[PDB]
């Protein structure tokens, strides 16, 4: 939690990587007027990256003032984020592969 520059560059350039992936991924789709399955997947993943950065921002803001809170939200996120992304993937794949 105390390595602010490393975590900040990590998150922000992860967002930039996601942006490049989204842009490259939409160069294949025909210009439809609505969201494809891959569009939902990309938007959800992009939101996850944005939320991880926001989580780090909260941790940094409450560190040095409520370090108990900062460590508590870190330990909670380590178990929340993947446990929510995995179930999202399961539901998405289950709904789309069976149609």
């Amino acid at each position: 939690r105390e390595s602010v520059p490393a975590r900040t560059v990590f998150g922000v350039t992860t967002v930039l990587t996601m942006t490049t992936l989204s842009i490259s991924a939409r160069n294949s789709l025909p210009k439809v007027a609505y969201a494809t399955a891959m569009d939902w997947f990309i938007a959800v993943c992009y939101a996850f990256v944005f939320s991880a950065l926001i989580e780090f921002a909260t941790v940094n803001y409450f560190t040095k003032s409520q370090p108990a809170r900062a460590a508590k939200i870190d330990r909670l996120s380590r178990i929340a984020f993947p446990l929510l992304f995995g179930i999202f993937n399961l539901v998405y794949w289950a709904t789309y592969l069976n149609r």
């Binding site: 900040t8 007027a33 609505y34 969201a35 950065l53």
Partner: protein, 194 residues
């Protein structure tokens, strides 16, 4: 909305020799409601018969006019959502403490880079239309906000050592008043372009 027409005239015969009308006069054009465009949506079609007047006489004419209303959800999802979220992500640097120089520089400058990348890849994906458009105005607005956020950080860093109090006051004011200005910009833009 793009009003796209089809004009039907007679080349050599004037109204003194030939007269045009729609057979049915309201059902003459069929199959239009069943048209499924990928990017638009026919909201209405009109049938207009008339006689146009030129020098050597009046020539008959019919006109089939479609009104195509462009679907928006795609453009939202692909262009606006990334830019808005990158603007917010640029804002994130304000909650990062003043000492975190490398952190706030990384965030702001990478947000500028990402905004440039989005702009210069949508410049290719979008049709090449060499005059200014509302999408371009919005992308410029987001870029200018990222620019202002990074300049605000630069000001804070410059004036800090002389007066932490004013540094922190500036930081808090910007924290409270860039979201305000961004909402104001969004409201004016979306109400002016709709």
């Amino acid at each position: 909305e793009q009003n796209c027409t089809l004009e039907i005239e007679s080349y050599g015969y004037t109204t003194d020799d030939i007269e045009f009308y729609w057979r049915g006069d309201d059902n003459a054009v069929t199959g239009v409601t069943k048209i499924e465009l990928p990017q638009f949506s026919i909201v209405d079609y009109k049938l207009i018969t008339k006689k146009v007047v030129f020098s050597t006489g009046s020539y008959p004419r019919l006109s089939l006019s479609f009104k195509l209303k462009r679907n928006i959800g795609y453009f939202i999802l692909q262009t606006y959502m990334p830019s808005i979220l990158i603007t917010i992500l640029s804002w994130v640097s304000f909650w990062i403490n003043y000492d975190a120089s490398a952190a706030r520089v990384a965030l702001g400058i990478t947000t500028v880079l990402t905004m440039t990348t989005i702009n210069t890849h949508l410049r290719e994906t979008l049709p090449k239309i060499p005059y200014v458009k509302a999408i371009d105005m919005y992308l410029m607005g987001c870029f200018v906000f990222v620019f202002m956020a990074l300049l605000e950080y630069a000001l804070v860093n410059y004036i800090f050592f002389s007066q932490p109090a004013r540094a922190a006051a500036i930081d808090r004011w910007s924290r409270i008043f860039f979201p305000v200005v961004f909402s104001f910009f969004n409201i004016v833009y979306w109400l002016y372009y709709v």
